Amino acid sequence: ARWFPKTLPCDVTLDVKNHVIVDCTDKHLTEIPGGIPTNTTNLTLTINHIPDISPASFHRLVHLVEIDFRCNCVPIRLGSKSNMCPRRLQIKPRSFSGLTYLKSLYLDGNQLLEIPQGLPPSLQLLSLEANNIFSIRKEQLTELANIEILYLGQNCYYRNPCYVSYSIEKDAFLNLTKLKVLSLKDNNVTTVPTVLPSTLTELYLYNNMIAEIQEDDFNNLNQLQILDLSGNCPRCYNAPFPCTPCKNNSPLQIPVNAFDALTELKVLRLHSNSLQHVPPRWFKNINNLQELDLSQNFLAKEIGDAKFLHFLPNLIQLDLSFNFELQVYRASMNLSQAFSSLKSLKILRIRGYVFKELKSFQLSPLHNLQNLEVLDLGTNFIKIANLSMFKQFKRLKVIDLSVNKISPVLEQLYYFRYDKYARSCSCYKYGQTLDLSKNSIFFIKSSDFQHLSFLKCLNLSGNLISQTLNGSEFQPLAELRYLDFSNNRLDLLHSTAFEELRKLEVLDISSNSHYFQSEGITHMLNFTKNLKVLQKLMMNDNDISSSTSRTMESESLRTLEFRGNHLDVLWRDGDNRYLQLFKNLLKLEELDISKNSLSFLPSGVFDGMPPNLKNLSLAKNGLKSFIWEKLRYLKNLETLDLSHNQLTTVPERLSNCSRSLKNLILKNNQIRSLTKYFLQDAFQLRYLDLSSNKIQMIQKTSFPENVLNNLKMLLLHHNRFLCTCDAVWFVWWVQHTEVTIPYLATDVTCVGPGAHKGQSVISLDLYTCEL
Ligand X SMILES: *[C@@H]1O[C@H](CO)[C@@H](O[C@@H]2O[C@H](CO)[C@@H](O)[C@H](O)[C@H]2NC(C)=O)[C@H](O)[C@H]1NC(C)=O
Q: Residues annotated in the binding site for guanosine, as ranges?
A: 381, 405, 491, 522
- Residue 70 binds ligand NAG (CB under 6 A): no
Preceding omega of 146 cis (within 30 degrees of 0): no
**Distance from C-alpha of 346 to C-alpha of 348, rounded to nearest angstrom:** 7
- Residue 768 binds ligand EWU (CB under 6 A): no
Binding partner of residue 520 among ligand EWU, ligand NAG, ligand X, none, CB cut-off 5 to 8 Å per kind: ligand EWU
Regarding beta strands 291-293 and 317-319, do their DSSP bridges make them parallel or antiparallel, or are they unpaired? parallel
Residue set of the binding site for Ca(2+) = 765
**Which one, 164 or 256, has the nearer CB to ligand X?**
164
**Distance from C-alpha of 204 to C-alpha of 213, rounded to nearest angstrom:** 14
**Distance from C-alpha of 689 to C-alpha of 462, rounded to nearest angstrom:** 36
**What one-character-per-residue DSSP string does 513-559 give?**
-TTTSSTT----GGGGGG-TT--EEE-TT------S-S--EESS--E
With contacts defined by CB under 6 A, name the span among 4-12, 22-30, 324-332, 659-667 that binds ligand EWU: 324-332
Binding partner of residue 103 among ligand X, ligand NAG, its own copies, none, CB cut-off 5 to 8 Å per kind: ligand NAG
**Distance from C-alpha of 43 to C-alpha of 66, rounded to nearest angstrom:** 6
Q: Among 31, 215, 575, 607, which residue interacts with its own copies (rule: CB under 8 A)?
A: 575
Q: Footprint of its own copies on residues 703-762 (CB under 8 A)?
A: none
State the Cα torsion 569-571-573-574 to the nearest 10°. Answer: 110
Binding partner of residue 354 among ligand EWU, ligand NAG, its own copies, none, CB cut-off 5 to 8 Å per kind: ligand EWU
Q: Footprint of ligand EWU on residues 412-441 (CB under 6 A)?
A: none
Preceding omega of 651 cis (within 30 degrees of 0): no
Are the C-beta atoms of 166 and 134 separated by less than 8 Å? yes
In whole angstroms, the minimum distance from the beta carbon of 468 to its own copies comes to: 9
**Which one, 354 or 525, has the nearer CB to ligand EWU?**
354
Output b/e per residue, 80-101; b: 16+ Cβ within 10 A: eeeeebeebbebeeebbebbee
Are the C-beta atoms of 272 and 230 separated by less than 8 Å? yes
**Distance from C-alpha of 654 to C-alpha of 751, rounded to nearest angstrom:** 28
Q: Among 158, 381, 600, 687, which residue interacts with ligand EWU (rule: CB under 6 A)?
A: 381
**Which one, 169 or 264, has the nearer CB to ligand X?**
169
Binding partner of residue 339 among ligand EWU, ligand X, ligand NAG, none, CB cut-off 5 to 8 Å per kind: none
**Distance from C-alpha of 368 to C-alpha of 359, rounded to nearest angstrom:** 17
Residue set of the binding site = 381, 405, 491, 522, 765
Q: How wide is the angle at C-alpha 94 spanned by C-alphas 93 and 99, nearest 5°?
A: 150
Is the dihedral angle over the CA atoms 24, 30, 36, 42 positive or is it negative?
positive
| Backbone torsions φ then ψ of 67, nearest 5 degrees | -120, 115
Binding partner of residue 768 among its own copies, ligand NAG, ligand X, none, CB cut-off 5 to 8 Å per kind: none
- Residue 513 binds ligand NAG (CB under 6 A): no
- Residue 470 binds ligand NAG (CB under 6 A): yes
With contacts defined by CB under 6 A, name the span among 110-118, 522-530, 538-546, 607-615 that binds ligand NAG: 522-530
In whole angstroms, the minimum distance from the beta carbon of 564 to ligand NAG comes to: 16
Q: Which residue is nearest to ligand X (CB)?
A: 161
Binding partner of residue 163 among ligand NAG, ligand X, its own copies, none, CB cut-off 5 to 8 Å per kind: ligand X
Binding partner of residue 156 among its own copies, ligand NAG, ligand X, none, CB cut-off 5 to 8 Å per kind: ligand X
- Residue 354 binds ligand EWU (CB under 6 A): yes
- Residue 520 binds its own copies (CB under 8 A): yes
Tell me, by CB under 6 A, how many residues bind ligand EWU: 15
- Residue 548 binds its own copies (CB under 8 A): yes
Nearest to 268 by CA among 208, 333, 314: 314
- Residue 548 binds ligand NAG (CB under 6 A): yes
**Which one, 128 or 585, has the nearer CB to ligand X?**
128
Count other Cβ atoms within 10 Å, centred on residue 597.
15
Q: Among 394, 572, 659, 712, which residue interacts with its own copies (rule: CB under 8 A)?
A: 572
**Spatial CB neighbours of 464, under 8 Å, sequence gap ≥ 6:** 407, 440, 441, 442, 488, 489
Q: Among 222, 386, 556, 648, which residue interacts with ligand NAG (rule: CB under 6 A)?
A: 386
With contacts defined by CB under 6 A, name the span among 79-87, 251-259, 325-333, 421-429 that binds ligand EWU: 325-333
**Which one, 30 or 327, has the nearer CB to ligand EWU?**
327
**Which one, 324 or 482, has the nearer CB to ligand EWU?**
324
| Backbone torsions φ then ψ of 126, nearest 5 degrees | -125, 125
Give me the long-range contacts of 761-769 (CB less than 8 A, separation at least 24). Answer: 761/721, 761/723, 761/730, 761/731, 761/734, 761/735, 762/5, 762/6, 762/7, 762/734, 762/735, 763/7, 764/723, 764/731, 764/735, 766/723, 766/725, 766/727, 766/728, 766/731, 768/725, 769/725, 769/728
35 secondary structure, DSSP code: T
Tell me, by CB under 6 A, how many residues bind ligand NAG: 40
Residues 508-547 vs ligand EWU: string with x where CB under 6 A? -------x----xxx-------------------------
**What one-character-per-residue DSSP string does 259-309 give?**
TTT-TT--EEE-TTS--S---GGGGTT-----EEE--SSS-HHHHTT-GGG
- Residue 461 binds ligand NAG (CB under 6 A): yes
- Count H helices, E strands: the chain? 4, 38
Are the C-beta atoms of 473 and 445 separated by less than 8 Å? yes
Residues 484-503 vs ligand EWU: string with x where CB under 6 A? -------x-x----------
Preceding omega of 189 cis (within 30 degrees of 0): no
Binding partner of residue 427 among ligand NAG, ligand X, ligand EWU, none, CB cut-off 5 to 8 Å per kind: ligand NAG
- Residue 231 binds ligand NAG (CB under 6 A): no
In whole angstroms, the minimum distance from the beta carbon of 77 to ligand NAG comes to: 25
Q: What is the CA radius of gyration of the chain?
A: 32
Output b/e per residue, 426-440; b: 16+ Cβ within 10 A: ebeebebbbbbbbbe
State the Cα torsion 449-453-456-460 to the nearest 10°. Answer: 10
In whole angstroms, the minimum distance from the beta carbon of 443 to its own copies comes to: 9
Residue ranges that bind ligand X, judged by CB under 6 A: 156-158, 161-165, 188
Binding partner of residue 724 among ligand X, ligand NAG, its own copies, none, CB cut-off 5 to 8 Å per kind: none
- Residue 765 binds its own copies (CB under 8 A): no
The residue count of the chain comes to 771
Nearest to 64 by CA among 50, 45, 51, 48: 45
With contacts defined by CB under 8 A, name the span among 154-162, 245-253, 263-271, 742-750 that binds its own copies: 154-162
With contacts defined by CB under 6 A, name the span among 91-99, 106-114, 320-328, 755-763 that binds ligand EWU: 320-328
Is the dihedral angle over the CA atoms 631, 634, 638, 640 positive or is it negative?
negative
Output b/e per residue, 376-403; b: 16+ Cβ within 10 A: bbbbbbbbebebebbeebeebbbbbbbb
With contacts defined by CB under 6 A, name the span among 136-144, 312-320, 457-465, 756-764 that binds ligand NAG: 457-465
Are the C-beta atoms of 637 and 616 separated by less than 8 Å? yes
- Residue 327 binds ligand EWU (CB under 6 A): yes
Binding partner of residue 62 among ligand NAG, its own copies, ligand X, none, CB cut-off 5 to 8 Å per kind: none
For ligand NAG, the binding residues (CB under 6 A) are 19, 21, 41-42, 65-66, 103-104, 301, 304-305, 334, 386, 388, 391, 402, 426-427, 435, 437-438, 450-451, 459, 461-462, 470, 472, 482, 484, 495, 524, 526, 529-530, 548-550, 632, 656
For its own copies, the binding residues (CB under 8 A) are 76-78, 80-82, 158-161, 238, 240-242, 322, 352, 379, 403, 405, 407, 412-416, 438, 440, 442, 462, 464, 466, 514, 517-522, 545-546, 548, 569, 572-577, 599-600, 624-625, 646
